[PDB]
């Protein structure tokens, strides 16, 4: 009797306290390292969040497995795109800053 289901729940809350910790930390300390950590925690937590909606709502055999596959593709693209934005562009912390004073 493995306990993957329980640990999954713990991860969800550990990334939630991490994400809550990162928003003020991104304000007080905007840097390249913060941009990557904010892209990593942001995409992971969102992935697990939507994952919960799919399991709650989508009733089906090859229906639930398909949506979970499509979500992983969407998240992997989202995280890599954010990483690309951090490396070859301004980066979230210096991007939001520009967007706001406008």
């Amino acid at each position: 009797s493995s306990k993957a289901a329980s640990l999954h729940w713990t991860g969800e809350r550990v990334v939630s306290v991490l994400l809550l910790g990162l928003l003020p930390a991104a304000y007080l300390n905007p840097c390249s390292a913060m941009d990557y950590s904010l892209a990593a925690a942001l995409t992971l937590h969102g992935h697990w969040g939507i994952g919960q909606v799919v399991t709650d709502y989508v009733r089906g055999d090859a229906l639930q497995k398909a949506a979970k596959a499509g979500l992983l593709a969407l998240s992997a693209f989202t995280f890599a795109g954010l990483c690309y934005f951090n490396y070859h562009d301004v980066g979230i912390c210096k991007a939001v800053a520009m967007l706001w004073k406008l």
Binding site: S1, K3, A4, A5, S6, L7, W9, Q52, T55, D56
Partner: protein, 239 residues
């Protein structure tokens, strides 16, 4: 002569081509008891004896007369009729449940879930049982207060939206609370394997603390609280 209007859900499976509809009844409160069930029986006895419903104690300790009164899952023998004659009282069967007839739902799945959690005292050594009472201190007993009272009305589980959408695989708060009840019982030795029984995404983990179960409870119990307490144990238990 104070006349009250009752809008009640009606369906006859023994009539062909019949589908869910609403039938209204009129009753004087001077001859009727204070409670909704008193009125339910009154129209059952005097007006229409097709109205088929569950009842027993009329005391609030069976969970027989469990139904959705005015958009709220409570007992009909505990809820008193709104004396306000301007409002029409809407009485419905317990939500998202297969209606057998006229406010009577199929609870057999709900019951089956109660069997799956195994609500009996389990000991590692059942060889010395039946001869001497198990010791339990008043503190160890206090832990069961607010849990053992669950009368299994099933107002609870079927007021949880998550239970409507996941009726088969999600156990529902009523069933879940009792699984907890048997965990903190200082006598029960099987606490770990009872937690290991919930190690899938559906069993307990379709809870998102909606908290619509507690507050509809006709006994003032707090299933939600106990569910969150299960979750804590689920991470803080070793092996």
């Amino acid at each position: 002569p104070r006349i009250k209007k009752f809008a009640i859900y009606r369906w006859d499976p023994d009539k062909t081509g019949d589908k869910p509809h609403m039938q209204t009844y009129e009753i004087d409160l001077n001859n009727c008891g204070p409670m909704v069930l008193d009125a339910l029986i009154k129209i059952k006895n005097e007006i229409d004896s097709t109205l088929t419903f569950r009842r027993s104690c009329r005391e609030g300790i069976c969970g027989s007369c469990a139904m959705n009164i005015n958009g709220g899952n409570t007992l009909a023998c505990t809820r008193r009729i709104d004396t306000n004659l301007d409002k029409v009282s809407k009485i419905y069967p317990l939500p998202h449940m297969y209606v057998i007839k006229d406010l009577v739902p199929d609870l057999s799945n709900f019951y089956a879930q109660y069997k799956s959690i195994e609500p009996y005292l389990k000991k590692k050594d059942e060889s010395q049982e039946g001869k001497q009472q198990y010791l339990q201190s008043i503190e160890e007993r206090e832990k069961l207060d607010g849990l053992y009272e669950c009368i299994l009305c099933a107002c609870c589980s079927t007021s949880c939206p998550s239970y409507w959408w996941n009726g088969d695989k999600y156990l529902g708060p009523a069933v879940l609370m009792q699984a907890y009840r048997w965990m903190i019982d200082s006598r029960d030795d099987f606490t770990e394997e009872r937690l290991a029984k919930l190690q899938d995404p559906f069993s307990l983990y379709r809870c998102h603390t909606i908290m619509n179960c507690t507050g509809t409870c006709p006994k003032g119990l707090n299933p939600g609280k106990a569910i969150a307490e299960i979750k804590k144990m689920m991470a803080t238990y070793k092996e």
